[PDB]
């Protein structure tokens with residue numbers, strides 16, 4: 001029987017490349033999405049064309065609220081309903097925007113940034129464990145200790161996620177569930193970003209003066225879920241071309 | 249004129265010793281508390297007996313919610329209302345209890361553990377900076393954040409987020425002359441509801457003296473970070489753990 | 498043409514497992530050894546028996562001394578002499594024994610513990626880079642470097658230095674397309690001098706399976722780092738420790 | 747009786763300020779020096795003018811060699827000879843220069859850079875602890891250890907080794923009541939050799955004030971750690987970097 005994976009925010013960019021590479025490895029995939037219905041569906045049809053009945057989609061908002069635990073439970077439940085098992089959880093979905101200290105209310109920013117980056121991964125982890133080569137892979141950030149100016153909530157969420165990865169690895173090890181992170185430095189830059197600002201970041205990267213492809217990020221996820229990683233838990237693998245090593 | 253400090257969860261235990269030492273150093277103090285009303289008032293009484301009009305209490309629930317921004321604004325506002333200034337913020341208040349992955353709802357556990365340990369400190373930092381000498385913030389972190397207690401994921405998540413806040417806020421507020429630092433206990437005053445057997449188990453693990461830090465030892469490190477002897481320290485987290493975090497399994 | 502790799506201390510245990518797996522991946526291999534001549538020649542025989550002219554041995558002491566740079570240069574030269582290229586360097590060889598602060602002279606212990614774990618890796622890295630596609634270096638580190646064993650200060654100093662080299666060399670050799678990474682075991686193959694009981698005590702502290710890593714499990718992570726699947730990875734140290742580093746005292 | 751302290755490389759710059767501040771706090775001091783005889787004696791004169799027979803100088807090369815262990819044993823002995831006790835050791839002396847991977851032989855650079863930054867502090871630590879069975883050791887580390895200067899592999903290896911020594915020694919010496927901590931400057935007094943324009947490039951990177959730390963700001967952190975206010979603190983490394991290490995490329 002083919003194993004199954006849930007990948008959150010899988011419609012586009014890194015999460016898409018993760019879903020694709022997992023599918024190519026032989027995984028059936030639950031493609032979670034929030035706003036990107038058309039892209040999520042186009043991905044599912046592409047993958048089902050490859051092998052029928054191997055891809056489904058799951059819509060949920062991952063903002064923190066009093067319904068988020070039920071939403072996260074439902075996303076895990078969807079994988080079991082589609083595929084009768086859930087072997088891999090990838091916490092990829094992420095809100096990302098500045099929140100300076102000095103039109104969204106602040107409580108909404110907290111809900112979105114802490115919810116997507118930290119609380120939803122925690123609830124999903126809970127649901128995943130309660131329902132049981134099992135592992136969870138969290139998309140972290142190589143630059144968590146050298147954060148972007150005015151990104152306190154985002155950075156707090158990514159720091160929290162490190163704590164989740166470590167705490168869950170310890171707690172779930174007896175159940176044989178491994179929990180690891182992949183930490184991009186600069187990968188796919190925002191779509192709006194002018195090439196000239198993209199280049200300011202690219203130039204900082206020691207290995208090649210370029211950003212990671214989504215596929216390069218996905219390669220590290222693939223390693224962490226594979227049988228080549230079966231003693232690996234609580235580890236966060238930077239995929240950053242040495243960017244985090246560069247002083248000011 | 250005397251500087252003023254806000255200390256959250258300052259009615260008992262470590263927050264209280266921090267409040268007292270700040271007061272002995274010359275600070276007027278806002279004693280924030282949540283449930284410990286009697287203890288809060290008793291401390292203000294004590295401190296005001298020593299120097300009149302140098303201590304006030306301020307009640308707030310620091311659980312995460314849509315009104316938490318208002319509560320945090322009001323804590324900082326109460327420092328200005330009492331003392332005309334706010335020089336020091338100490339983020340001490342914290343919920344601490346297990347939340348295993350396998351009688352409160354999970355929603356409530358998220359709100360309390362993430363609210364008190366991370367979100368309220370962020371909002372307090374925001375309100376503090378916006379109302380702005382030697383200005384600084386001290387966050388009560390955890391020396392064991394990368395070697396966490398089993399089944400404490402939400403607690404450990406909040407303390408990890410707090411590290412991120414300390415670093416992010418240090419960077420962003422440095423242009424305003426506001427320093428932001430941490431003090432990270434290993435084992436200090438042990439939980440009231442911890443059994444004496446577990447207490448002694450923790451004590452035996454500490455290389456330096458086989459005992460927990462007194463509240464006053466933790467407070468001493470807070471005092472250093474807010475002092476003139478720390479004017480170039482920002483984004484630093486000082487472990488006060490007697491070497492506990494260095495001890496392998 | 499098949500790529501070529503140098504593995505230090507490759508005669509036995511983890512070094513052998515990396516050498517074997519690299520060879521199974523299609524590398525030709527320089528099996529470096531110090532005292533274990535028979536085991537190193539036995540491995541080379543086995544590997545050549547699988548594919549003719551794909552393995553050679555190379556004897557060298559990696560203790561620090563004024564000729565260590567010539568020795569390390571010679572190890573790289575040996576790979577080029579045998580195979581006409583050198584694609585991968587794995588720094589595995591390591592002295593490991595206690596050096597309490599309170600029959601070897603202390604200067605010999607420094608030379609052996611710092612030489613094998615840090616200086617030789619640095620000299621080999623220099624020689625490797627100077628002689629230069631998927632070029633990389635992998636350094637066998639220690640997951641427990643921040644939670645060290647009692648009385649192993651020089652060994653721990655050496656492994657910490659190795660972390661700095663990993664990061665320093667990743668930064669400086671990135672323009673040359675040489676990636677530099679580490680793999681950090683927790684407990685893998687226990688020391689042969691360790692009795693089963695002391696072995697079991699270590700085994701029992703591992704959250705993931707309560708067992709040590711097989712030599713193969715360590716080799717799997719080396720194989721990933723040198724692969725095309727890790728082409729953007731440099732300066733990273735991958736723990737392969739079953740959660741051991743996360744477990745508090 | 748007044749306590750006594752050893753400060754290595756104490757003739758100038760940061761080591762000088764540490765020595766002055768320790769003396770002002772009431773310590774008698776051993777001023778160690780290698781080349782700076784004139785300056786070491788000048789500081790001695792100034793301190794002894796303040797309180798008679800409270801400062802002595804001590805000459806040693808701290809480069810790694812066969813005689814280094816004897817040299818370090820003698821630095822510690824000089825403190826006992828002068829003052830009948832040795833309460834504090836500050837490992838400040840340091841060689842600092844590039845050693846690109848791709849003048850001095852490389853083994854001489856290993857000897858100086860790893861010797862001064864790591865091996866000498868290890869040997870001094872041994873000699874300090876042995877003569878015992880508020881004692882502490884403070885090591886001068888580097889806030890930028892994980893974001894090193896380009897082409898400074900050996901230096902960076904030495905400072906990483908020093909972090910390892912700090913933690914290993916804290917663990918091993920805790921049962922003796924000897925605390926072991928570090929202070930990690932970012933940019934303080936810029937190297938005299940450094941060009942003026944490059945000095946200003948570094949200053950402008952510092953979030954807190956866009957300036958370097960004075961030597962006295964570094965010393966302030968040393969003073970805290972050796973004080974009774976840091977009595978539960980061991981294995982801690984306090985950054986004094988004005989946020990510098992927080993700033994991304």
Ligand SMILES: NC(=O)c1ccc[n+]([C@@H]2O[C@H](COP(=O)([O-])OP(=O)(O)OC[C@H]3O[C@@H](n4cnc5c(N)ncnc54)[C@H](OP(=O)(O)O)[C@@H]3O)[C@@H](O)[C@H]2O)c1
Pocket residue numbers: 008009010011012013014015032033034035036037060061062063091092093094095096112116139140141142183184185186187188189
């Ligand atoms: N790209 C980089 O340079 C970089 C660098 C460091 C770390 N990372 C991390 O790597 C991961 C992938 O990065 P990325 O650039 O591919 O991410 P991204 O495009 O910025 O976001 C990924 C997806 O997250 C989902 N999302 C946002 N808000 C949500 C909400 N409220 N509820 C549910 N889903 C929500 C979105 O789904 P919909 O489109 O369906 O609405 C989005 O497509 C992220 O975790 C990120 O933090 C990336």
Ligand SMILES: NC(=O)c1ccc[n+]([C@@H]2O[C@H](COP(=O)([O-])OP(=O)(O)OC[C@H]3O[C@@H](n4cnc5c(N)ncnc54)[C@H](OP(=O)(O)O)[C@@H]3O)[C@@H](O)[C@H]2O)c1
Pocket residue numbers: 256257258259260261262263280281282283284285308309310311339340341342343344360364388389390391432433434435436437438439
């Ligand atoms: N004690 C240790 O060994 C240790 C170890 C590591 C880290 N720390 C950290 O050091 C700090 C002080 O430790 P501690 O043991 O003194 O803390 P504590 O007694 O467990 O908590 C301090 C105060 O936090 C307040 N608090 C809890 N929930 C709150 C809420 N929902 N809203 C507002 N306030 C709330 C409580 O105030 P009221 O009583 O008024 O209700 C409580 O007295 C904490 O941040 C802790 O995480 C302590």
Ligand SMILES: NC(=O)c1ccc[n+]([C@@H]2O[C@H](COP(=O)([O-])OP(=O)(O)OC[C@H]3O[C@@H](n4cnc5c(N)ncnc54)[C@H](OP(=O)(O)O)[C@@H]3O)[C@@H](O)[C@H]2O)c1
Pocket residue numbers: 505506507508509510511512529530531532533534557558559560588589590591592593609613637638639640681682683684685686687688
């Ligand atoms: N075993 C574990 O649980 C564990 C845990 C953490 C890290 N590690 C790291 O992983 C790596 C492999 O571990 P291991 O247990 O397989 O190592 P090991 O058996 O203790 O040592 C591997 C080889 O190092 C070589 N070596 C020792 N001194 C040397 C010298 N002066 N000059 C040249 N070579 C010398 C020896 O070669 P000869 O036999 O030919 O003389 C030895 O076979 C090491 O770097 C180790 O520090 C292992």
Ligand SMILES: NC(=O)c1ccc[n+]([C@@H]2O[C@H](COP(=O)([O-])OP(=O)(O)OC[C@H]3O[C@@H](n4cnc5c(N)ncnc54)[C@H](OP(=O)(O)O)[C@@H]3O)[C@@H](O)[C@H]2O)c1
Pocket residue numbers: 754755756757758759760761778779780781782783806807808809837838839840841842858862886887888889930931932933934935936937
């Ligand atoms: N200044 C900074 O921005 C900065 C930044 C990060 C870390 N640090 C650390 O803080 C400490 C003080 O820095 P600094 O700039 O004051 O240091 P420094 O001037 O570069 O060196 C201090 C002293 O070290 C002694 N020294 C050098 N080589 C020696 C050897 N082979 N044997 C014995 N002594 C030797 C010298 O003594 P003699 O003059 O008597 O020959 C020198 O005056 C150092 O450990 C340094 O790495 C400083």
Ligand SMILES: COc1ccc(-c2[nH]c3nc(N)[nH]c(=O)c3c2C#N)cc1
Pocket residue numbers: 093094095096141143146147148185186187188189190994
């Ligand atoms: C301080 O360095 C960085 C650089 C990029 C990022 C980064 N994080 C992101 N998270 C999401 N969800 N989407 C993104 O595009 C990014 C991103 C970038 N670029 C974070 C820290």
Ligand SMILES: COc1ccc(-c2[nH]c3nc(N)[nH]c(=O)c3c2C#N)cc1
Pocket residue numbers: 341342343344390392393395396397434435436437438439745
């Ligand atoms: C894994 O080691 C520890 C030990 C103690 C603690 C700890 N955190 C606390 N937070 C609050 N608010 N109150 C406490 O008593 C503690 C506590 C302890 N003990 C955390 C991690």
Ligand SMILES: COc1ccc(-c2[nH]c3nc(N)[nH]c(=O)c3c2C#N)cc1
Pocket residue numbers: 496590591592593639641644645646683684685686687688
């Ligand atoms: C604190 O946990 C550990 C456990 C094992 C080791 C360890 N390091 C070694 N290095 C060499 N060269 N050979 C070994 O066998 C080990 C070893 C073990 N076990 C170090 C720290």
Ligand SMILES: COc1ccc(-c2[nH]c3nc(N)[nH]c(=O)c3c2C#N)cc1
Pocket residue numbers: 247839840841842888890893894895932933934935936937
């Ligand atoms: C990457 O940022 C830095 C900044 C300063 C230093 C630094 N290290 C030193 N060591 C000695 N012995 N003397 C020095 O002046 C410095 C120094 C500087 N500046 C190192 C790394």
